[PDB]
Amino acid sequence: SDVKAEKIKNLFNEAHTTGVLVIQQGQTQQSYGNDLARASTEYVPASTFKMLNALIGLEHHKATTTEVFKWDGKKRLFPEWEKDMTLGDAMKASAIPVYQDLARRIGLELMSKEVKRVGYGNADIGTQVDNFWLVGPLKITPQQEAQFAYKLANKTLPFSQKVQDEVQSMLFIEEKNGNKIYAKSGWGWDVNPQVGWLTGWVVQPQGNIVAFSLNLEMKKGIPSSVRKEITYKSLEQLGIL
Ligand SMILES: [Zn+2]
Ligand SMILES: [Zn+2]
C-alpha cells in the first residue's frame, strides 16, 4: 500500500524525527516510515540486546528465571533500579546494571561465541563484556532486529525451546482481541546521534507471527513514549493489530 505507507511516514514526520518500521512475515520484509534507508543501517542495539543476553545467560545456567540479582548499594541511573530484581523484572525496567552483571557471569569468551553463533548484527563485541551493546562495537540493522525477533517468536534460534519460551515470557506486553504483543524497547543515549528502538512481534489470533522493529533518532524534546505510540499506531494502520 501507499495510503497506509503514507500515514506511517507521516507518523514519523509528526514526531519530528526520522525513523523506519520493519515488518516481517514468513521470510519477507517490508519497510515503512520517512527514512527507509535506516532499515539497512547499523546502530548500537542498546537495551534490545537484553533479549539475546537473557537467552545466553539462561541457556548456560548463569541465571535462572527466578533468581534475584541483588542491588549492591551503589547509586544507579534511576531510583527504580535500586532494588533486587529478576531478569524478567530487569527486562521490563530496562535495568542495565542487572544485565551488565549477567554479561559478566557469561564472560567475554562465551558471550562472543554465542553472539557469533546466532549471527547477531555485526557480531563484534570487542573486549569490554559489560557495555559493548551500549557504546559499540556491536551494531545491528532494523532488518536484522526484525529477523531476530521473528526467529525468537518461532523458537528457531539456536537455543533450547525452554529458554526461548522463558525469554518470550519476559517480553510479553499484553493480549488484546486475541493478538499477543511482545516487545523490548531500546535507547542508545551514549552514542551520537541517539538511537531509539522498539523490537518485538505480534502473535495473531491463529498463531501467525508478525515481527517488527521500529528504529528512529532520539532527538531532544522527543519523549520516550514516541516509540510505542508510532509502533502501535502503525500496526493498527496495517491491520496487524
Ligand atoms: Zn509538530
Ligand atoms: Zn554452557
Side-chain angles (χ1 to χ4, degrees):
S1 163
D2 278 331
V3 181
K4 59 187 165 120
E6 193 68 22
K7 308 223 216 167
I8 295 162
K9 174 191 205 167
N10 281 322
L11 288 176
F12 285 99
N13 288 327
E14 277 165 22
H16 300 293
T17 185
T18 52
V20 74
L21 173 68
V22 179
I23 307 282
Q24 178 165 340
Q25 301 189 64
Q27 296 305 118
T28 71
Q29 291 188 339
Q30 39 269 26
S31 293
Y32 308 84
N34 65 358
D35 190 355
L36 303 179
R38 299 184 64 96
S40 54
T41 308
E42 292 189 324
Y43 305 92
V44 300
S47 290
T48 67
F49 182 71
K50 286 189 176 64
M51 295 185 273
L52 181 48
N53 202 356
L55 287 166
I56 296 164
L58 292 170
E59 178 75 15
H60 300 275
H61 289 242
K62 313 297 191 187
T64 71
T65 69
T66 55
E67 169 159 12
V68 169
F69 282 72
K70 312 281 247 308
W71 182 35
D72 58 4
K74 320 188 180 207
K75 208 189 164 54
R76 287 172 171 188
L77 256 175
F78 303 94
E80 301 83 338
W81 292 356
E82 303 180 328
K83 310 165 174 151
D84 300 355
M85 55 184 130
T86 62
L87 288 182
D89 295 328
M91 185 82 78
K92 178 185 186 185
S94 295
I96 300 185
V98 170
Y99 276 79
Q100 291 180 307
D101 178 289
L102 181 60
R104 288 188 287 265
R105 295 182 185 192
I106 290 158
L108 195 62
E109 177 192 318
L110 174 60
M111 184 75 83
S112 173
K113 170 187 175 170
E114 296 301 81
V115 169
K116 297 181 190 301
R117 203 170 53 84
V118 158
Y120 185 91
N122 63 9
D124 181 16
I125 78 168
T127 68
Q128 191 63 20
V129 78
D130 45 29
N131 71 2
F132 57 81
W133 65 94
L134 300 166
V135 295
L138 184 62
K139 294 197 181 189
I140 188 167
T141 78
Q143 290 173 334
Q144 293 167 321
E145 287 249 347
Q147 180 186 45
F148 176 81
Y150 190 83
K151 292 185 280 165
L152 175 53
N154 283 285
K155 295 196 274 180
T156 62
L157 294 171
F159 298 104
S160 70
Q161 294 294 299
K162 168 181 185 288
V163 163
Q164 295 183 78
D165 187 72
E166 287 166 346
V167 176
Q168 291 195 7
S169 297
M170 297 180 185
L171 298 171
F172 174 70
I173 306 303
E174 65 187 322
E175 180 174 0
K176 64 164 112 193
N177 301 326
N179 296 287
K180 298 206 252 193
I181 303 168
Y182 302 76
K184 179 78 195 75
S185 74
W187 189 349
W189 59 69
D190 290 310
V191 295
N192 183 47
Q194 294 176 20
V195 60
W197 289 102
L198 187 64
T199 296
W201 67 95
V202 170
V203 188
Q204 289 187 310
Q206 312 310 319
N208 170 72
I209 289 165
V210 187
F212 61 83
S213 180
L214 175 137
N215 173 288
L216 50 70
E217 186 172 321
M218 295 293 299
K219 312 173 175 186
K220 309 321 197 92
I222 286 161
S224 77
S225 53
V226 64
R227 290 162 300 170
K228 170 154 188 266
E229 297 183 275
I230 298 182
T231 296
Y232 274 45
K233 285 174 179 166
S234 310
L235 295 177
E236 282 166 25
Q237 274 273 57
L238 299 164
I240 300 166
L241 284 182

Short mmCIF file of all heavy atoms in Angstrom, two decimals, residues 90-122:
data_model
loop_
_atom_site.label_atom_id
_atom_site.label_comp_id
_atom_site.label_asym_id
_atom_site.label_seq_id
_atom_site.Cartn_x
_atom_site.Cartn_y
_atom_site.Cartn_z
N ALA A 90 14.05 -7.00 35.43
CA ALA A 90 15.04 -6.09 34.85
C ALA A 90 14.80 -5.88 33.36
O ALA A 90 15.19 -4.83 32.81
CB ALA A 90 16.45 -6.63 35.10
N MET A 91 14.16 -6.85 32.69
CA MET A 91 13.81 -6.68 31.28
C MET A 91 12.73 -5.62 31.11
O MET A 91 12.83 -4.73 30.25
CB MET A 91 13.33 -8.02 30.71
CG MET A 91 13.06 -7.99 29.22
SD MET A 91 14.58 -8.20 28.27
CE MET A 91 14.83 -9.97 28.41
N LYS A 92 11.68 -5.70 31.92
CA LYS A 92 10.63 -4.70 31.86
C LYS A 92 11.14 -3.32 32.28
O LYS A 92 10.71 -2.31 31.73
CB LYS A 92 9.45 -5.14 32.74
CG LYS A 92 8.29 -4.16 32.81
CD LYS A 92 7.26 -4.67 33.80
CE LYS A 92 6.00 -3.82 33.81
NZ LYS A 92 5.07 -4.29 34.88
N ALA A 93 12.07 -3.26 33.23
CA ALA A 93 12.61 -1.98 33.65
C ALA A 93 13.77 -1.50 32.78
O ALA A 93 14.26 -0.39 33.01
CB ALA A 93 13.06 -2.04 35.12
N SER A 94 14.21 -2.29 31.79
CA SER A 94 15.46 -2.00 31.05
C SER A 94 16.60 -1.68 32.02
O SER A 94 17.37 -0.75 31.81
CB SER A 94 15.28 -0.85 30.06
OG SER A 94 14.37 -1.17 29.02
N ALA A 95 16.70 -2.46 33.09
CA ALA A 95 17.67 -2.21 34.16
C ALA A 95 19.06 -2.68 33.74
O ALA A 95 19.49 -3.78 34.07
CB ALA A 95 17.23 -2.88 35.46
N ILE A 96 19.77 -1.81 33.03
CA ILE A 96 21.12 -2.05 32.51
C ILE A 96 22.06 -2.73 33.50
O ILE A 96 22.67 -3.74 33.13
CB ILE A 96 21.73 -0.72 32.03
CG1 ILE A 96 20.87 -0.11 30.92
CG2 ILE A 96 23.15 -0.93 31.54
CD1 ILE A 96 21.48 1.16 30.31
N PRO A 97 22.23 -2.23 34.74
CA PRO A 97 23.22 -2.86 35.64
C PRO A 97 22.96 -4.33 35.91
O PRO A 97 23.92 -5.10 36.10
CB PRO A 97 23.09 -2.03 36.92
CG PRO A 97 22.46 -0.77 36.51
CD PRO A 97 21.55 -1.10 35.39
N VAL A 98 21.70 -4.75 35.99
CA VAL A 98 21.41 -6.17 36.19
C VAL A 98 21.95 -6.99 35.03
O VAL A 98 22.58 -8.04 35.22
CB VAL A 98 19.89 -6.39 36.36
CG1 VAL A 98 19.59 -7.87 36.32
CG2 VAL A 98 19.41 -5.77 37.66
N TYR A 99 21.71 -6.52 33.80
CA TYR A 99 22.18 -7.25 32.63
C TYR A 99 23.68 -7.09 32.42
O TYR A 99 24.30 -7.95 31.78
CB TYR A 99 21.35 -6.83 31.41
CG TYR A 99 20.05 -7.62 31.35
CD1 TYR A 99 18.97 -7.27 32.14
CD2 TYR A 99 19.96 -8.77 30.56
CE1 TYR A 99 17.80 -8.01 32.12
CE2 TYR A 99 18.79 -9.52 30.54
CZ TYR A 99 17.72 -9.14 31.32
OH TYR A 99 16.56 -9.88 31.31
N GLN A 100 24.28 -6.05 32.98
CA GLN A 100 25.74 -5.99 33.00
C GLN A 100 26.33 -7.04 33.93
O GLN A 100 27.36 -7.65 33.63
CB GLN A 100 26.21 -4.59 33.39
CG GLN A 100 25.90 -3.53 32.32
CD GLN A 100 26.38 -2.15 32.74
OE1 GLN A 100 26.04 -1.67 33.82
NE2 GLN A 100 27.16 -1.50 31.89
N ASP A 101 25.69 -7.26 35.09
CA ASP A 101 26.14 -8.34 35.95
C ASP A 101 26.00 -9.67 35.22
O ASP A 101 26.92 -10.49 35.22
CB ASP A 101 25.35 -8.34 37.26
CG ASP A 101 25.74 -9.49 38.18
OD1 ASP A 101 25.42 -10.66 37.89
OD2 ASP A 101 26.40 -9.20 39.21
N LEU A 102 24.85 -9.90 34.57
CA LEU A 102 24.64 -11.13 33.80
C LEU A 102 25.74 -11.31 32.76
O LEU A 102 26.27 -12.41 32.60
CB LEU A 102 23.27 -11.10 33.13
CG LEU A 102 22.90 -12.34 32.29
CD1 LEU A 102 22.88 -13.60 33.14
CD2 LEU A 102 21.52 -12.14 31.59
N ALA A 103 26.05 -10.25 32.02
CA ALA A 103 27.07 -10.33 30.97
C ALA A 103 28.42 -10.74 31.56
O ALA A 103 29.18 -11.49 30.93
CB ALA A 103 27.20 -8.99 30.25
N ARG A 104 28.74 -10.25 32.76
CA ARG A 104 29.99 -10.61 33.42
C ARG A 104 29.97 -12.07 33.88
O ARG A 104 31.00 -12.76 33.82
CB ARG A 104 30.27 -9.65 34.59
CG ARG A 104 30.68 -8.24 34.14
CD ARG A 104 31.15 -7.34 35.30
NE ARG A 104 30.05 -6.89 36.14
CZ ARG A 104 29.41 -5.72 36.01
NH1 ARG A 104 29.77 -4.85 35.07
NH2 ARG A 104 28.42 -5.42 36.83
N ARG A 105 28.82 -12.58 34.32
CA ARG A 105 28.71 -14.01 34.61
C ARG A 105 28.95 -14.85 33.36
O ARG A 105 29.63 -15.88 33.40
CB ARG A 105 27.34 -14.34 35.19
CG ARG A 105 27.06 -13.73 36.53
CD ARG A 105 25.70 -14.18 36.98
NE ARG A 105 25.29 -13.54 38.23
CZ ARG A 105 24.24 -13.95 38.94
NH1 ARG A 105 23.53 -14.99 38.51
NH2 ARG A 105 23.91 -13.33 40.05
N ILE A 106 28.36 -14.44 32.23
CA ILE A 106 28.59 -15.14 30.97
C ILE A 106 30.07 -15.07 30.59
O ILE A 106 30.68 -16.07 30.20
CB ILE A 106 27.70 -14.55 29.86
CG1 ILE A 106 26.21 -14.89 30.09
CG2 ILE A 106 28.21 -14.96 28.48
CD1 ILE A 106 25.23 -13.93 29.38
N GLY A 107 30.67 -13.89 30.71
CA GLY A 107 32.06 -13.71 30.35
C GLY A 107 32.27 -13.48 28.86
O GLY A 107 31.46 -13.86 28.02
N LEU A 108 33.42 -12.88 28.54
CA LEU A 108 33.67 -12.43 27.17
C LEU A 108 33.72 -13.59 26.18
O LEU A 108 33.14 -13.52 25.08
CB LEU A 108 34.99 -11.64 27.13
CG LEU A 108 35.30 -10.79 25.90
CD1 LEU A 108 34.28 -9.67 25.68
CD2 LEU A 108 36.70 -10.22 26.06
N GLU A 109 34.42 -14.66 26.54
CA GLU A 109 34.64 -15.74 25.59
C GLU A 109 33.32 -16.42 25.20
O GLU A 109 33.04 -16.61 24.01
CB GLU A 109 35.62 -16.76 26.18
CG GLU A 109 35.87 -17.99 25.31
CD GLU A 109 36.62 -19.06 26.06
OE1 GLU A 109 37.57 -18.71 26.79
OE2 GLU A 109 36.26 -20.25 25.96
N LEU A 110 32.50 -16.78 26.19
CA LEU A 110 31.21 -17.39 25.88
C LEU A 110 30.26 -16.39 25.21
O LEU A 110 29.52 -16.76 24.29
CB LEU A 110 30.58 -17.96 27.16
CG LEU A 110 29.15 -18.52 27.05
CD1 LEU A 110 29.04 -19.66 26.04
CD2 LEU A 110 28.58 -18.93 28.42
N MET A 111 30.26 -15.13 25.66
CA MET A 111 29.38 -14.13 25.03
C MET A 111 29.72 -13.96 23.56
O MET A 111 28.82 -13.90 22.71
CB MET A 111 29.51 -12.78 25.74
CG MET A 111 28.54 -11.73 25.18
SD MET A 111 26.82 -12.00 25.73
CE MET A 111 26.92 -11.19 27.34
N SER A 112 31.01 -13.86 23.25
CA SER A 112 31.41 -13.65 21.87
C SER A 112 31.06 -14.85 21.01
O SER A 112 30.62 -14.70 19.87
CB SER A 112 32.91 -13.35 21.80
OG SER A 112 33.38 -13.30 20.47
N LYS A 113 31.22 -16.06 21.56
CA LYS A 113 30.88 -17.26 20.79
C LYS A 113 29.39 -17.29 20.46
O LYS A 113 29.00 -17.62 19.34
CB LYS A 113 31.28 -18.52 21.56
CG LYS A 113 30.73 -19.78 20.91
CD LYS A 113 30.97 -21.02 21.77
CE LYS A 113 30.31 -22.25 21.14
NZ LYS A 113 30.72 -23.52 21.80
N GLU A 114 28.55 -17.00 21.46
CA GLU A 114 27.11 -17.12 21.26
C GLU A 114 26.59 -16.03 20.33
O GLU A 114 25.73 -16.30 19.48
CB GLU A 114 26.39 -17.06 22.61
CG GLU A 114 26.72 -18.24 23.52
CD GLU A 114 26.38 -19.58 22.90
OE1 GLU A 114 27.18 -20.08 22.08
OE2 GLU A 114 25.31 -20.13 23.22
N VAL A 115 27.09 -14.80 20.47
CA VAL A 115 26.71 -13.75 19.53
C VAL A 115 27.08 -14.13 18.10
O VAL A 115 26.29 -13.92 17.16
CB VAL A 115 27.34 -12.41 19.95
CG1 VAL A 115 27.18 -11.37 18.84
CG2 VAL A 115 26.72 -11.90 21.25
N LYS A 116 28.26 -14.73 17.89
CA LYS A 116 28.62 -15.12 16.52
C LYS A 116 27.85 -16.35 16.07
O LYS A 116 27.51 -16.48 14.89
CB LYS A 116 30.12 -15.37 16.39
CG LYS A 116 31.01 -14.16 16.64
CD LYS A 116 32.47 -14.57 16.45
CE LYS A 116 33.44 -13.49 16.91
NZ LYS A 116 33.23 -12.22 16.17
N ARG A 117 27.58 -17.28 16.99
CA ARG A 117 26.81 -18.47 16.61
C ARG A 117 25.41 -18.08 16.17
O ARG A 117 24.87 -18.63 15.20
CB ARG A 117 26.77 -19.46 17.78
CG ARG A 117 26.49 -20.90 17.39
CD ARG A 117 26.70 -21.85 18.56
NE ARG A 117 25.95 -21.44 19.74
CZ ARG A 117 24.67 -21.74 19.94
NH1 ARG A 117 24.03 -22.47 19.04
NH2 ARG A 117 24.04 -21.32 21.03
N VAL A 118 24.79 -17.12 16.87
CA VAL A 118 23.46 -16.64 16.48
C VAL A 118 23.54 -15.82 15.19
O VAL A 118 22.65 -15.89 14.34
CB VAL A 118 22.84 -15.84 17.64
CG1 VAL A 118 21.75 -14.90 17.16
CG2 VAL A 118 22.27 -16.79 18.70
N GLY A 119 24.61 -15.04 15.02
CA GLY A 119 24.76 -14.20 13.86
C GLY A 119 24.08 -12.86 14.05
O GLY A 119 23.33 -12.39 13.19
N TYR A 120 24.36 -12.21 15.18
CA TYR A 120 23.59 -11.05 15.62
C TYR A 120 24.29 -9.79 15.15
O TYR A 120 25.36 -9.45 15.66
CB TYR A 120 23.46 -11.08 17.13
CG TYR A 120 22.60 -10.00 17.72
CD1 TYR A 120 21.24 -10.21 17.92
CD2 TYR A 120 23.15 -8.79 18.13
CE1 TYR A 120 20.44 -9.23 18.49
CE2 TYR A 120 22.36 -7.81 18.70
CZ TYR A 120 21.00 -8.04 18.88
OH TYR A 120 20.20 -7.08 19.45
N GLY A 121 23.68 -9.09 14.18
CA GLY A 121 24.28 -7.85 13.70
C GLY A 121 25.68 -8.09 13.16
O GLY A 121 25.93 -9.08 12.48
N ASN A 122 26.60 -7.18 13.48
CA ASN A 122 27.98 -7.41 13.04
C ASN A 122 28.70 -8.41 13.92
O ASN A 122 29.86 -8.72 13.64
CB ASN A 122 28.77 -6.08 12.97
CG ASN A 122 28.91 -5.39 14.31
OD1 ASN A 122 28.58 -5.93 15.37
ND2 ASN A 122 29.44 -4.17 14.28
#
